[PDB]
């Protein structure tokens, strides 16, 4: 599945940090969300994360020569190699 | 039950739009998602360079433009790098659980022209938790740096790990044929060549010609002793038929892992083994009718190359469609989707031929890693893509395919680009998945 | 408010996996949709061969196969036919409303080789209502039959219907252009040449380095007017000034509606208009320092070609990318993306280019037919294929676009192709939506 | 929205008429199920019936050179140039 709903719901969530100053960590947001939705569509939503967690901008250390690590999820086999979405852009 | 060698990872240092990164390639699977321009093919890229450092092969024409014997234009890289120093480097973990590390460094000479100066090297010993970005740069300042092959040596000098540079690529690889990663053994330029062209014919993917025309080339093996037990009446010309059978033997293996394949309306590949009919005359004489001068005679009638036995075979692939059982491969007569699925069958059989032929110069705890791509994936129905997977499990083999759309497959590794501006300068920003399913 | 003229269907008679087939054109997007192997490029291809039935260019590579100069390689559209009578009819509907049917009879030629005999006609007056196809086939015992143009001659003689069968191909084009459908005037093999090579460069996509070398032959118009007004001091110079200008104004035009443009990292493209320093000086000497001998010194010093302005101009194509802003395009630098999205806009200003270099031998009241392809549309990401299609809309443009998916846009009509088998014969189910959005 | 849950719910509905003699008329059945769901996924949806009718068999009339004709739904623009499935395949 892919809703547009879910999607504008799933803007509502991420974008929730945009505002405060609280970076975006995939890790623990997708561990987060996931646990909402069964592993139905579990690759499908936390791709939607991914994609839109990019939109609202980058991560800083990305540039300063630091390997990111696999942080896993689930009691399963679930990773995600991503930084930590510092700076965000308007 | 041996263990096979697996490659690692793949990082760019200071590569355009990507300073330092490292992408994790999966035990099977690995694809590489994001849109047009977003950097996909330059990572393949730099894999293919640190692979094989020969600026004489190298050469990235762009997809659109295949079947091209351009042989002037610009060849390609020079632009995917940055200014300065760059690297390009290879993580490979050994049959023996080895962690060995063969890169390249990239360096575009003095801002003049677009020529590009490289470097092969290697590293060992590093520990599996050291990250490969962090042996390649500093910390300077609060400010990152990356650092020269002279400051590599330093750096690893009065350590355990050992930083070796070559200075003839033919060490170099000369050393991953070792250390058991590359299928083969790249000797000389002639072998290079090869080695490339086969690399170069699954990024771009379909049915390579330079390798049809000349398939016995890529298949048939040279038995190291037909001519040693020789040179020290019909004999040969039973130990020779005695040896194009026991390879047509071998080839008729391969050949059954490609009955049941499933591309576009091709249903099957063989590798059909027929023999030269002149050859076919001059083996019915030594038979039921100085040496070398002897049979240079016969084959007149009706040197030395009369002895090599793969000179007298003649191979041809061939599809198998629902309609007419079993035609010649032709690309003009096949869609895309089955074009890139027969050539990539093909290369099935050269890397197992390769692998297999190379047994002896190779330890026996070693089986060389075995790594395909797949570049614009999307050209393949699910049906289609359905059988390379399969096909790439049962022979236990490793894929990266980049995908021009924002849906990659789930059986595997994902790693999304997403090229974005900052300091006015591009920055991929990636994102990788993996575990679901 | 001129109507412009639309292609209206597309009719395969007994082509392989098709006996008899129409394929209704949208308004404005058409998508085939089928996976590999099902029979959208040999549909594609039937359309070429009618619009063009020269078997001199007719040549369908595989794509993986496309910068190929191969020229002895089998031409691959024999086998896309089936044996016996063949068709391929085009139905345009006139800026008059004029529903006019072109197409060609395609036949094997007595199964002995793979080659293919082509003889091109023009049915006119058909009925609003009669289907194309119910003209090309009868109900022989209640089987269907292909009726031959010898048999066309006859049903249609005693009716109002205009059968022109054509003996040259030159006059095909030359219908074809009065009842306004091509852009151009095919007079000649150059002329046929040039139409083709872009038609090729559409279907493969990308970057034609052929039209791109000779970019002042696609685009530059031969002003009737420039010879005869000289023909019949400075003044030269002047007017051939005078003229440059007027062109590059021309160009300055097109040039705006590519401007905000998103092909991968590609944010527009300009036709750089450069004057050849060579003639550059000449034109400086005309003005500051038996006649076509005159300039044939002025050039040796520092013959009628030096009349011809075109011969002064020196094209060149550029795209923006946010970071060197407008660099010459090319290849080698650029994604298959933002290639193909490059190419495919070259060839809408060489479009524009021709139809309005061609309002004056044409009617007023007639404006030709603008139909573009895309094969392999997987390769854009839906971001590109967004600026293909805003594009299209914005200079009122038909478009066939081949997916290798089972997703199409949901702008415009979708024909679904899926290859079965029955009678152990190929037979392609199509089926066609529209309206949803 | 792509569903397994419709699609098998789907192949219901269309192997109905696979059962008896009945061909399918993808335009009445189309008419019929869209009907079901809104303007949401139309597209979507007929393009699984359209997919699924031609699994379960194909035309006979098809084979016999006579143009299929665009048989509009609603009360808007929806059209299917399609013939009927008659001779069906197990
Ligand atoms: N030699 C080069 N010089 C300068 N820029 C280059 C060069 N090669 C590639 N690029 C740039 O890098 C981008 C393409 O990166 P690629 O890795 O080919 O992207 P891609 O993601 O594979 O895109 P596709 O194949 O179109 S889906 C383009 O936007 C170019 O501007
Ligand atoms: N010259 C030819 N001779 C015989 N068969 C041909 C020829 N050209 C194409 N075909 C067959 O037609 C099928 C391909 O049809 P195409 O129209 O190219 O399919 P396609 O749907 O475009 O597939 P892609 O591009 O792979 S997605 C193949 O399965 C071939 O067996
Ligand atoms: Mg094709
Ligand atoms: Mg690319």
Redesign the pocket.
């Given at each position: 599945d892919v809703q547009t709903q879910i999607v504008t719901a799933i803007q509502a969530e991420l974008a929730h940090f945009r505002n405060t100053a609280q970076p975006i960590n995939l890790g623990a947001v997708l561990q987060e969300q996931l646990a909402r939705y069964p592993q139905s569509r579990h690759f499908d939503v936390a791709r939607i994360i991914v994609d839109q967690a990019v939109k609202l901008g980058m991560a800083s250390q990305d540039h300063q020569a630091v390997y990111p690590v696999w942080q896993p999820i689930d009691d399963f086999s679930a990773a995600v190699q991503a930084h930590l979405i510092d700076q965000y852009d308007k | 039950m041996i263990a096979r060698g697996k490659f690692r990872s793949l990082t760019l240092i200071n590569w355009?739009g990507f300073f330092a990164r490292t992408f994790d390639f999966d035990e099977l699977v690995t694809t590489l998602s994001?849109?047009?321009?977003?950097?996909?093919?330059?990572?393949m890229?730099g894999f293919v360079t640190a692979l094989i450092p020969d600026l004489t092969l190298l050469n990235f024409r762009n997809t659109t433009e295949a079947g091209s014997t351009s042989s002037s234009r610009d060849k390609?890289?020079?632009?995917?790098l940055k200014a300065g120093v760059c690297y390009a480097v290879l993580e490979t973990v050994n049959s023996r659980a080895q962690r060995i590390i063969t890169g390249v460094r990239l360096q575009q000479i003095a801002g003049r022209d677009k020529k590009v100066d490289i470097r092969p090297f290697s590293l060992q010993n590093v520990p599996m938790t050291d990250s490969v970005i962090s042996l390649f740069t500093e910390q300077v300042a609060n400010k990152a740096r990356v650092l020269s092959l002279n400051d590599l040596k330093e750096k690893f000098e009065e350590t355990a790990v050992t930083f070796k540079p070559y200075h003839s690529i033919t060490d170099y690889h000369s050393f991953m044929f070792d250390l058991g990663i590359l299928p083969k053994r790249l000797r000389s330029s002639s072998d290079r060549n090869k080695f490339y062209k086969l690399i170069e014919a699954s990024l771009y993917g379909g049915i390579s010609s330079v390798i049809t025309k000349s398939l016995r080339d890529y298949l048939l093996p040279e038995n190291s002793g037909v001519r040693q037990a020789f040179q020290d009446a019909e004999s040969v010309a039973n130990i020779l038929r005695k040896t194009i059978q026991r390879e047509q033997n071998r080839i008729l293996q391969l050949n059954q892992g490609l009955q049941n394949i499933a591309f576009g309306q091709v249903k099957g590949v063989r590798l059909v083994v027929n023999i030269r009919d002149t050859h076919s005359i001059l083996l019915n004489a030594l038979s039921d009718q100085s040496f070398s001068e002897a049979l240079a005679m016969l084959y007149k009638r009706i040197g030395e190359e009369l002895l090599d036995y793969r000179n007298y075979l003649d191979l041809e692939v061939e599809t198998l469609r629902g309609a007419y059982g079993w035609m010649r491969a032709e690309s003009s007569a096949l869609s895309t989707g089955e074009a890139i699925g027969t050539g990539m069958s093909i290369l099935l059989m050269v890397v197992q031929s390769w692998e297999e032929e190379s047994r002896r110069m190779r330890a026996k705890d070693i089986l060389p890693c075995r790594l395909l791509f797949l570049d614009?994936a999307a050209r393949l129905d699910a049906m289609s893509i359905n059988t390379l997977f399969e096909l790439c499990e049962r022979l236990d083999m490793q894929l990266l395919i980049?995908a021009?759309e924002n849906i990659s497959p789930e059986r595997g590794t994902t790693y999304k680009?997403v090229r974005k501006i900052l300091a006015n300068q591009e920055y991929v920003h990636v994102v990788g998945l993996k575990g679901f399913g």
């Amino acid at each position: 599945d892919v809703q547009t709903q879910i999607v504008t719901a799933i803007q509502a969530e991420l974008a929730h940090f945009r505002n405060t100053a609280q970076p975006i960590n995939l890790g623990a947001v997708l561990q987060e969300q996931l646990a909402r939705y069964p592993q139905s569509r579990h690759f499908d939503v936390a791709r939607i994360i991914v994609d839109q967690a990019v939109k609202l901008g980058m991560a800083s250390q990305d540039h300063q020569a630091v390997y990111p690590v696999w942080q896993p999820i689930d009691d399963f086999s679930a990773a995600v190699q991503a930084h930590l979405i510092d700076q965000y852009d308007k | 039950m041996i263990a096979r060698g697996k490659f690692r990872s793949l990082t760019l240092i200071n590569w355009n739009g990507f300073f330092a990164r490292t992408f994790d390639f999966d035990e099977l699977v690995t694809t590489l998602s994001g849109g047009n321009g977003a950097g996909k093919s330059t990572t393949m890229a730099g894999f293919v360079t640190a692979l094989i450092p020969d600026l004489t092969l190298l050469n990235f024409r762009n997809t659109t433009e295949a079947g091209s014997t351009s042989s002037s234009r610009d060849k390609g890289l020079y632009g995917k790098l940055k200014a300065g120093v760059c690297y390009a480097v290879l993580e490979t973990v050994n049959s023996r659980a080895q962690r060995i590390i063969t890169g390249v460094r990239l360096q575009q000479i003095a801002g003049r022209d677009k020529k590009v100066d490289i470097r092969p090297f290697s590293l060992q010993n590093v520990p599996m938790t050291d990250s490969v970005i962090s042996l390649f740069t500093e910390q300077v300042a609060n400010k990152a740096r990356v650092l020269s092959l002279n400051d590599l040596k330093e750096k690893f000098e009065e350590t355990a790990v050992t930083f070796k540079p070559y200075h003839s690529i033919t060490d170099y690889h000369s050393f991953m044929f070792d250390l058991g990663i590359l299928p083969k053994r790249l000797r000389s330029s002639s072998d290079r060549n090869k080695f490339y062209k086969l690399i170069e014919a699954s990024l771009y993917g379909g049915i390579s010609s330079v390798i049809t025309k000349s398939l016995r080339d890529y298949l048939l093996p040279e038995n190291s002793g037909v001519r040693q037990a020789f040179q020290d009446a019909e004999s040969v010309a039973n130990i020779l038929r005695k040896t194009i059978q026991r390879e047509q033997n071998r080839i008729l293996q391969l050949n059954q892992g490609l009955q049941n394949i499933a591309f576009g309306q091709v249903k099957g590949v063989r590798l059909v083994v027929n023999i030269r009919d002149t050859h076919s005359i001059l083996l019915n004489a030594l038979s039921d009718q100085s040496f070398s001068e002897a049979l240079a005679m016969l084959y007149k009638r009706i040197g030395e190359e009369l002895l090599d036995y793969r000179n007298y075979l003649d191979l041809e692939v061939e599809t198998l469609r629902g309609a007419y059982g079993w035609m010649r491969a032709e690309s003009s007569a096949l869609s895309t989707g089955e074009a890139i699925g027969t050539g990539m069958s093909i290369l099935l059989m050269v890397v197992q031929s390769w692998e297999e032929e190379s047994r002896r110069m190779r330890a026996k705890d070693i089986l060389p890693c075995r790594l395909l791509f797949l570049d614009q994936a999307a050209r393949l129905d699910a049906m289609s893509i359905n059988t390379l997977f399969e096909l790439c499990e049962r022979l236990d083999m490793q894929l990266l395919i980049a995908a021009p759309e924002n849906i990659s497959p789930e059986r595997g590794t994902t790693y999304k680009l997403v090229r974005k501006i900052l300091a006015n300068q591009e920055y991929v920003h990636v994102v990788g998945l993996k575990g679901f399913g």
